[PDB]
Amino acid sequence: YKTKPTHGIGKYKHLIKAETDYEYGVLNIHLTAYDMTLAESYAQYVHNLCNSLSIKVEESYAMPTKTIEVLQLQMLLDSVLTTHERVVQISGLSATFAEIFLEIIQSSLPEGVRLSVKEHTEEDFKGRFKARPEL
Amino acid sequence: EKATQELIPIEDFITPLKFLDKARERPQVELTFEETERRALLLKKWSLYKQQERKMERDTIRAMLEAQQEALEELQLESPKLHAEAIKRDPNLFPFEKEGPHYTPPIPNYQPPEGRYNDITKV
Amino acid sequence: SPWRLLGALCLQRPPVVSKPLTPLQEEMASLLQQIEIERSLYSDHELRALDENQRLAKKKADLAQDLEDMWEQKFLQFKLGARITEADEKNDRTSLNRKLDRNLVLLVREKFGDQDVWILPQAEWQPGETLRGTAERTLATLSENNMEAKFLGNAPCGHYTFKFLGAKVFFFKALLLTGDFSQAGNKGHHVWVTKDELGDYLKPKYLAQVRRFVSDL
Amino acid sequence: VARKERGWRTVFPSREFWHRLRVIRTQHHVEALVEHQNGKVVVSASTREWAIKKHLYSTRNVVACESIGRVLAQRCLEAGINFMVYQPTPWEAASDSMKRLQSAMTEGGVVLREPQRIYE
Amino acid sequence: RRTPPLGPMPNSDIDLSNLERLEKYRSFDRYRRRAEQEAQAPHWWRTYREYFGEKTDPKEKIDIGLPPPKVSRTQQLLERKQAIQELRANVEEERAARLRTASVPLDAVRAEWERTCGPYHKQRLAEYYGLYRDLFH
Amino acid sequence: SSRASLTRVHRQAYARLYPVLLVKQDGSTIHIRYREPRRMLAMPIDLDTSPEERRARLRK
RNA sequence: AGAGUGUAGCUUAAACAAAGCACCCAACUUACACUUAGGAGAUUCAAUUGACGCUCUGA
């Protein structure tokens, strides 16, 4: 009851969420590789170590894969390969901490991988949706 | 513009229509007791190995962090502006690109056969 | 109060070849391959193989093998790259060919009036400059060849002092993207080296702190 | 004839019992407590005890769970507690460990259903 | 009208100025454990305990009885470690545990229990049944 | 290092994916799991702006 | 060379004992997370007092 000292004992909305340098905007991490399983395992390791370091992770998603056909014209020969792309979004990594972060990532990086790390841009987000030609 | 843009389907999360045929099915060779025991022992040994790996990873990263912070606080005590200069970010360090290791090093003089490539993707 | 401030760069070359797996790692890899082939589903190869074997079985009462044999022969014909170089490990210690499995770092021949020491390159800092400035100044001075050493951080990584009067060097880290070994005749004996024989080589205790600081991995 | 605390329909533990079983399995040990609605224990069992731990391989496997169950059923029907109650979560009940535990207890001779209170 | 809170209000130790860094209850069981320990902790407001609890005196319960023997804890733990490591080194217990077929001698367990720590459990049972409060007041 | 490479195929209903070698333009070699039991694929080159260089590599 | 310190990573836990948390492998999960089923750990030595390890303070 309001008058009594027990007021406000039950409220929880202020606990739960309502809905310069050393402040790094939302960064994106692309991982391209021929092995979908290797890509997934590396992304899983990254997500687990991020959770361990208590660094925030917005979301992780897969970009549309793509298959490429290669043909040798000495005589005509054909072959095909696939390429898979994973993406992670992070934020809040400290300045000096980002150094060791990226360094450990590079060190534990396995073969058959290409990793890019950049600032999150609307271009990346709009490159996921179908390229509707009507517009 | 106000329409909810669709998302390109991922071909990895879509089982090919030609994967449900019942003609593929293989006979399943029942496992032996000793082989299953070997499998379980292998799994637990590898779990131990991985936890030791992450233990030494923790140690390395903690040592690196504490040493970096010692250097940082010494620089702060000595030069009260260069520590802020170091804490400042820098844009050229955000965009990185790197490759992974290789099963073998590049050959000094090796040319591949003459061919071309072509990407194939759908909406 | 005679002081002196130095900046230094430490480039870490990552290896290009995978580290040779532990026997346990290789055995569990074989086990994973076994489990994967056990749980796997049919592919076009298995389809055509089994179907044409059954076709042959039918025709007897009434190729994939050729392709895989040809592929095996092509594999045997082709030659792979070298991993370890016994000669280059000794006579070309100042080379990349000796070790492609683990990360590398260099060391320079430095001399001081008070004590001659085998240490990592450094340079003197002046006021109108950043420590990273001194770092790229040192690399541009001591490179003497075509190679770029890209940075990975602005924060300080090492702090090491010594008295005679007082000198204080701060170490930054950097990445090694390219590198050659031209101008082989040098005063400073630059040598790409790993942590083990680095520790075996050099004496100091500030350097021992460098040892425990640098990641072994 | 006693009165059990009927109510608390909104909260998960239903206090309408006389003797409750509470199982706590950690990542190191496993214990089972038979207590009264007062919150005061009447009998206990735990893998932490040396008598039970010396005979066992692991303090946390299904074997440990069913062994604690059998020992606790022995203690219960020694202490006269032939009826008792157990409020598990969905996954806690679906687990094979607790399933085999309660099966061991039932075959030991204790049912996890308490009689219906009398008064006419 | 308002009044100050007598005791320290709950959920006051946490900081809300920083909320995302904080760790969250990711398990009903964690929340339940927290709740049980909170409930067993005392509080200044009126609660279930001070109505439906026996209201045991805060003073000690007098018992001039047989004290425990002086057992050398060092060699006790040493022998226990020897026993547990011998058991772990044994070979059949692995398959026994991983196939869920093992058991234990009930008689031996009972004997070792009543020798080691039976008396405490029996004291608990007695004070439950009310023998002590009725006999020795 | 490379430790998270060897892994279980985190997917249900996966066809045969056998290990195979892949060679880039520089001769660098890597592993990739591929459908049929190949032994190596190789990446070719198509186009540079030098017309005389294109003609020379076509001759040789 | 001198000062401090000292339970597995954390906990001023210590009888009925080395407890709880943290952590790791596998499965579901796009992934994380939950959950299930499994995995390893220690108070350095002699009687709170000394002597083996740790940090700091000097050359």
mmCIF file of N, CA, C and O (backbone and C1' of nucleotides) in Angstrom, chain D residues 25-29 48-50 53 57-58 60-63 91-92 95-98, chain G residues 8-9 15-24 34-42:
data_model
loop_
_atom_site.group_PDB
_atom_site.id
_atom_site.type_symbol
_atom_site.label_atom_id
_atom_site.label_comp_id
_atom_site.label_asym_id
_atom_site.label_seq_id
_atom_site.Cartn_x
_atom_site.Cartn_y
_atom_site.Cartn_z
ATOM 1 N N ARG D 25 19.737 -31.911 -7.876
ATOM 2 C CA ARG D 25 20.938 -32.423 -8.515
ATOM 3 C C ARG D 25 21.774 -31.246 -8.996
ATOM 4 O O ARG D 25 21.305 -30.431 -9.798
ATOM 5 N N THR D 26 22.994 -31.145 -8.485
ATOM 6 C CA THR D 26 23.952 -30.149 -8.931
ATOM 7 C C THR D 26 24.866 -30.759 -9.987
ATOM 8 O O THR D 26 24.692 -31.902 -10.416
ATOM 9 N N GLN D 27 25.857 -29.982 -10.411
ATOM 10 C CA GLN D 27 26.891 -30.494 -11.298
ATOM 11 C C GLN D 27 28.005 -31.197 -10.541
ATOM 12 O O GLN D 27 29.049 -31.492 -11.133
ATOM 13 N N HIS D 28 27.811 -31.468 -9.258
ATOM 14 C CA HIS D 28 28.771 -32.213 -8.453
ATOM 15 C C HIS D 28 28.144 -33.360 -7.675
ATOM 16 O O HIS D 28 28.778 -34.407 -7.523
ATOM 17 N N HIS D 29 26.921 -33.192 -7.177
ATOM 18 C CA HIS D 29 26.295 -34.186 -6.315
ATOM 19 C C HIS D 29 24.793 -34.198 -6.572
ATOM 20 O O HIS D 29 24.270 -33.413 -7.366
ATOM 21 N N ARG D 48 26.648 -36.920 -1.259
ATOM 22 C CA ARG D 48 27.792 -36.391 -0.530
ATOM 23 C C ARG D 48 28.242 -37.318 0.588
ATOM 24 O O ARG D 48 29.394 -37.229 1.026
ATOM 25 N N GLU D 49 27.367 -38.199 1.063
ATOM 26 C CA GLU D 49 27.727 -39.080 2.161
ATOM 27 C C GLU D 49 28.735 -40.122 1.697
ATOM 28 O O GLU D 49 28.609 -40.697 0.613
ATOM 29 N N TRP D 50 29.742 -40.364 2.536
ATOM 30 C CA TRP D 50 30.819 -41.271 2.156
ATOM 31 C C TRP D 50 30.324 -42.707 2.036
ATOM 32 O O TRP D 50 30.765 -43.448 1.149
ATOM 33 N N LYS D 53 28.916 -42.835 -1.321
ATOM 34 C CA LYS D 53 29.805 -42.403 -2.390
ATOM 35 C C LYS D 53 30.934 -43.393 -2.641
ATOM 36 O O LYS D 53 31.451 -43.460 -3.761
ATOM 37 N N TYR D 57 30.443 -45.024 -8.887
ATOM 38 C CA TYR D 57 31.382 -44.522 -9.883
ATOM 39 C C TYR D 57 31.279 -43.010 -10.026
ATOM 40 O O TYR D 57 32.281 -42.297 -9.905
ATOM 41 N N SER D 58 30.075 -42.506 -10.283
ATOM 42 C CA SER D 58 29.837 -41.083 -10.457
ATOM 43 C C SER D 58 28.667 -40.657 -9.586
ATOM 44 O O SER D 58 27.704 -41.408 -9.412
ATOM 45 N N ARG D 60 26.504 -38.374 -10.158
ATOM 46 C CA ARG D 60 25.546 -37.579 -10.909
ATOM 47 C C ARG D 60 24.829 -38.341 -12.010
ATOM 48 O O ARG D 60 23.973 -37.756 -12.680
ATOM 49 N N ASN D 61 25.146 -39.611 -12.226
ATOM 50 C CA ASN D 61 24.531 -40.357 -13.307
ATOM 51 C C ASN D 61 23.162 -40.895 -12.895
ATOM 52 O O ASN D 61 22.729 -40.787 -11.742
ATOM 53 N N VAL D 62 22.479 -41.492 -13.873
ATOM 54 C CA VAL D 62 21.201 -42.139 -13.609
ATOM 55 C C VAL D 62 21.363 -43.220 -12.554
ATOM 56 O O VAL D 62 20.443 -43.478 -11.767
ATOM 57 N N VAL D 63 22.521 -43.879 -12.525
ATOM 58 C CA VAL D 63 22.779 -44.876 -11.493
ATOM 59 C C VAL D 63 22.739 -44.226 -10.119
ATOM 60 O O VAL D 63 22.126 -44.747 -9.181
ATOM 61 N N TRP D 91 10.163 -31.038 -17.831
ATOM 62 C CA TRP D 91 11.388 -31.705 -18.254
ATOM 63 C C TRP D 91 11.973 -32.546 -17.129
ATOM 64 O O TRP D 91 12.524 -33.626 -17.374
ATOM 65 N N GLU D 92 11.855 -32.074 -15.889
ATOM 66 C CA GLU D 92 12.339 -32.854 -14.757
ATOM 67 C C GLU D 92 11.597 -34.177 -14.641
ATOM 68 O O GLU D 92 12.179 -35.182 -14.220
ATOM 69 N N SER D 95 12.614 -36.506 -17.736
ATOM 70 C CA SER D 95 13.963 -37.046 -17.683
ATOM 71 C C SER D 95 13.931 -38.515 -17.287
ATOM 72 O O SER D 95 13.122 -38.935 -16.455
ATOM 73 N N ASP D 96 14.821 -39.300 -17.893
ATOM 74 C CA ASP D 96 14.879 -40.720 -17.572
ATOM 75 C C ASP D 96 15.411 -40.945 -16.164
ATOM 76 O O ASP D 96 15.045 -41.930 -15.512
ATOM 77 N N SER D 97 16.255 -40.036 -15.675
ATOM 78 C CA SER D 97 16.844 -40.199 -14.353
ATOM 79 C C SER D 97 15.770 -40.206 -13.272
ATOM 80 O O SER D 97 15.649 -41.164 -12.501
ATOM 81 N N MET D 98 14.974 -39.139 -13.206
ATOM 82 C CA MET D 98 13.938 -39.059 -12.181
ATOM 83 C C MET D 98 12.844 -40.092 -12.406
ATOM 84 O O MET D 98 12.241 -40.578 -11.442
ATOM 85 P P A G 8 42.783 -21.981 -5.732
ATOM 86 O "O5'" A G 8 42.260 -23.163 -6.665
ATOM 87 C "C5'" A G 8 43.167 -24.124 -7.182
ATOM 88 C "C4'" A G 8 42.549 -24.959 -8.277
ATOM 89 C "C3'" A G 8 41.766 -24.209 -9.342
ATOM 90 O "O3'" A G 8 42.601 -23.623 -10.327
ATOM 91 C "C1'" A G 8 40.561 -26.136 -8.662
ATOM 92 P P G G 9 43.061 -22.090 -10.199
ATOM 93 O "O5'" G G 9 42.036 -21.296 -11.125
ATOM 94 C "C5'" G G 9 42.324 -19.973 -11.553
ATOM 95 C "C4'" G G 9 41.068 -19.160 -11.727
ATOM 96 C "C3'" G G 9 40.288 -18.875 -10.453
ATOM 97 O "O3'" G G 9 40.806 -17.766 -9.739
ATOM 98 C "C1'" G G 9 38.809 -19.638 -12.137
ATOM 99 P P A G 15 35.295 -30.999 11.755
ATOM 100 O "O5'" A G 15 34.799 -32.254 12.602
ATOM 101 C "C5'" A G 15 33.655 -32.997 12.208
ATOM 102 C "C4'" A G 15 32.384 -32.334 12.670
ATOM 103 C "C3'" A G 15 31.093 -33.086 12.384
ATOM 104 O "O3'" A G 15 30.832 -34.110 13.327
ATOM 105 C "C1'" A G 15 30.839 -30.809 11.785
ATOM 106 P P C G 16 30.977 -35.660 12.918
ATOM 107 O "O5'" C G 16 30.280 -35.771 11.489
ATOM 108 C "C5'" C G 16 30.591 -36.858 10.622
ATOM 109 C "C4'" C G 16 29.600 -36.991 9.491
ATOM 110 C "C3'" C G 16 29.906 -36.149 8.253
ATOM 111 O "O3'" C G 16 29.526 -36.858 7.073
ATOM 112 C "C1'" C G 16 27.780 -35.570 9.091
ATOM 113 P P A G 17 30.644 -37.407 6.058
ATOM 114 O "O5'" A G 17 30.644 -36.341 4.873
ATOM 115 C "C5'" A G 17 30.829 -34.953 5.137
ATOM 116 C "C4'" A G 17 31.463 -34.242 3.970
ATOM 117 C "C3'" A G 17 32.707 -34.916 3.400
ATOM 118 O "O3'" A G 17 32.772 -34.706 1.992
ATOM 119 C "C1'" A G 17 33.268 -32.754 4.143
ATOM 120 P P A G 18 33.352 -35.854 1.032
ATOM 121 O "O5'" A G 18 34.820 -35.353 0.669
ATOM 122 C "C5'" A G 18 35.016 -34.316 -0.280
ATOM 123 C "C4'" A G 18 35.041 -32.960 0.373
ATOM 124 C "C3'" A G 18 34.767 -31.780 -0.545
ATOM 125 O "O3'" A G 18 33.388 -31.567 -0.775
ATOM 126 C "C1'" A G 18 36.672 -31.322 0.767
ATOM 127 P P A G 19 32.731 -31.967 -2.184
ATOM 128 O "O5'" A G 19 31.417 -31.071 -2.248
ATOM 129 C "C5'" A G 19 30.393 -31.213 -1.276
ATOM 130 C "C4'" A G 19 29.672 -29.911 -1.045
ATOM 131 C "C3'" A G 19 29.260 -29.156 -2.296
ATOM 132 O "O3'" A G 19 28.050 -29.625 -2.858
ATOM 133 C "C1'" A G 19 30.357 -27.677 -0.834
ATOM 134 P P G G 20 27.873 -29.628 -4.450
ATOM 135 O "O5'" G G 20 27.497 -28.116 -4.774
ATOM 136 C "C5'" G G 20 26.436 -27.477 -4.082
ATOM 137 C "C4'" G G 20 26.438 -25.990 -4.311
ATOM 138 C "C3'" G G 20 26.639 -25.535 -5.746
ATOM 139 O "O3'" G G 20 25.472 -25.622 -6.541
ATOM 140 C "C1'" G G 20 28.043 -24.281 -4.335
ATOM 141 P P C G 21 25.606 -25.695 -8.140
ATOM 142 O "O5'" C G 21 26.366 -24.348 -8.522
ATOM 143 C "C5'" C G 21 25.718 -23.095 -8.382
ATOM 144 C "C4'" C G 21 26.646 -21.939 -8.654
ATOM 145 C "C3'" C G 21 27.203 -21.839 -10.064
ATOM 146 O "O3'" C G 21 26.287 -21.314 -11.006
ATOM 147 C "C1'" C G 21 28.943 -21.490 -8.515
ATOM 148 P P A G 22 26.367 -21.789 -12.540
ATOM 149 O "O5'" A G 22 27.847 -21.402 -12.986
ATOM 150 C "C5'" A G 22 28.245 -20.042 -13.049
ATOM 151 C "C4'" A G 22 29.712 -19.885 -13.369
ATOM 152 C "C3'" A G 22 30.210 -20.550 -14.640
ATOM 153 O "O3'" A G 22 29.878 -19.855 -15.827
ATOM 154 C "C1'" A G 22 31.705 -21.031 -12.900
ATOM 155 P P C G 23 29.362 -20.681 -17.105
ATOM 156 O "O5'" C G 23 30.552 -21.701 -17.402
ATOM 157 C "C5'" C G 23 31.840 -21.214 -17.743
ATOM 158 C "C4'" C G 23 32.858 -22.318 -17.893
ATOM 159 C "C3'" C G 23 32.592 -23.343 -18.982
ATOM 160 O "O3'" C G 23 32.892 -22.869 -20.282
ATOM 161 C "C1'" C G 23 33.296 -24.448 -17.020
ATOM 162 P P C G 24 32.071 -23.423 -21.545
ATOM 163 O "O5'" C G 24 32.612 -24.910 -21.731
ATOM 164 C "C5'" C G 24 33.987 -25.152 -21.981
ATOM 165 C "C4'" C G 24 34.274 -26.619 -22.187
ATOM 166 C "C3'" C G 24 33.323 -27.365 -23.108
ATOM 167 O "O3'" C G 24 33.612 -27.175 -24.481
ATOM 168 C "C1'" C G 24 33.645 -28.622 -21.140
ATOM 169 P P C G 34 21.821 -21.903 -21.108
ATOM 170 O "O5'" C G 34 20.343 -22.485 -21.016
ATOM 171 C "C5'" C G 34 19.314 -21.717 -20.414
ATOM 172 C "C4'" C G 34 17.955 -22.341 -20.602
ATOM 173 C "C3'" C G 34 17.799 -23.772 -20.121
ATOM 174 O "O3'" C G 34 17.628 -23.873 -18.719
ATOM 175 C "C1'" C G 34 16.819 -23.545 -22.256
ATOM 176 P P U G 35 18.371 -25.042 -17.904
ATOM 177 O "O5'" U G 35 17.798 -26.376 -18.556
ATOM 178 C "C5'" U G 35 16.406 -26.651 -18.529
ATOM 179 C "C4'" U G 35 16.049 -27.814 -19.418
ATOM 180 C "C3'" U G 35 16.888 -29.069 -19.242
ATOM 181 O "O3'" U G 35 16.474 -29.856 -18.140
ATOM 182 C "C1'" U G 35 16.712 -28.567 -21.538
ATOM 183 P P U G 36 17.537 -30.746 -17.332
ATOM 184 O "O5'" U G 36 17.725 -32.032 -18.250
ATOM 185 C "C5'" U G 36 16.606 -32.809 -18.650
ATOM 186 C "C4'" U G 36 16.983 -33.817 -19.704
ATOM 187 C "C3'" U G 36 18.127 -34.750 -19.343
ATOM 188 O "O3'" U G 36 17.715 -35.855 -18.557
ATOM 189 C "C1'" U G 36 18.507 -33.842 -21.485
ATOM 190 P P A G 37 18.747 -36.549 -17.539
ATOM 191 O "O5'" A G 37 19.931 -37.061 -18.474
ATOM 192 C "C5'" A G 37 19.805 -38.262 -19.219
ATOM 193 C "C4'" A G 37 21.092 -38.605 -19.927
ATOM 194 C "C3'" A G 37 22.334 -38.663 -19.049
ATOM 195 O "O3'" A G 37 22.489 -39.901 -18.381
ATOM 196 C "C1'" A G 37 22.784 -37.346 -20.953
ATOM 197 P P G G 38 23.663 -40.083 -17.300
ATOM 198 O "O5'" G G 38 24.993 -40.050 -18.174
ATOM 199 C "C5'" G G 38 26.252 -39.788 -17.572
ATOM 200 C "C4'" G G 38 27.295 -39.430 -18.599
ATOM 201 C "C3'" G G 38 28.596 -38.855 -18.061
ATOM 202 O "O3'" G G 38 29.495 -39.839 -17.589
ATOM 203 C "C1'" G G 38 27.831 -37.503 -19.828
ATOM 204 P P G G 39 30.522 -39.478 -16.409
ATOM 205 O "O5'" G G 39 31.398 -38.297 -17.022
ATOM 206 C "C5'" G G 39 32.293 -38.540 -18.096
ATOM 207 C "C4'" G G 39 33.314 -37.437 -18.226
ATOM 208 C "C3'" G G 39 33.929 -36.951 -16.926
ATOM 209 O "O3'" G G 39 34.964 -37.798 -16.461
ATOM 210 C "C1'" G G 39 33.301 -35.094 -18.253
ATOM 211 P P A G 40 35.367 -37.801 -14.906
ATOM 212 O "O5'" A G 40 36.353 -36.560 -14.761
ATOM 213 C "C5'" A G 40 37.653 -36.595 -15.329
ATOM 214 C "C4'" A G 40 38.442 -35.364 -14.969
ATOM 215 C "C3'" A G 40 38.357 -34.928 -13.515
ATOM 216 O "O3'" A G 40 39.229 -35.653 -12.666
ATOM 217 C "C1'" A G 40 38.008 -33.060 -14.915
ATOM 218 P P G G 41 38.953 -35.705 -11.083
ATOM 219 O "O5'" G G 41 39.478 -34.296 -10.561
ATOM 220 C "C5'" G G 41 40.816 -33.893 -10.804
ATOM 221 C "C4'" G G 41 40.978 -32.399 -10.690
ATOM 222 C "C3'" G G 41 40.678 -31.793 -9.329
ATOM 223 O "O3'" G G 41 41.757 -31.919 -8.421
ATOM 224 C "C1'" G G 41 39.660 -30.494 -11.029
ATOM 225 P P A G 42 41.729 -33.036 -7.270
ATOM 226 O "O5'" A G 42 42.676 -32.434 -6.138
ATOM 227 C "C5'" A G 42 43.952 -31.908 -6.467
ATOM 228 C "C4'" A G 42 43.998 -30.412 -6.279
ATOM 229 C "C3'" A G 42 43.921 -29.919 -4.845
ATOM 230 O "O3'" A G 42 45.162 -29.987 -4.164
ATOM 231 C "C1'" A G 42 42.408 -28.691 -6.169
#
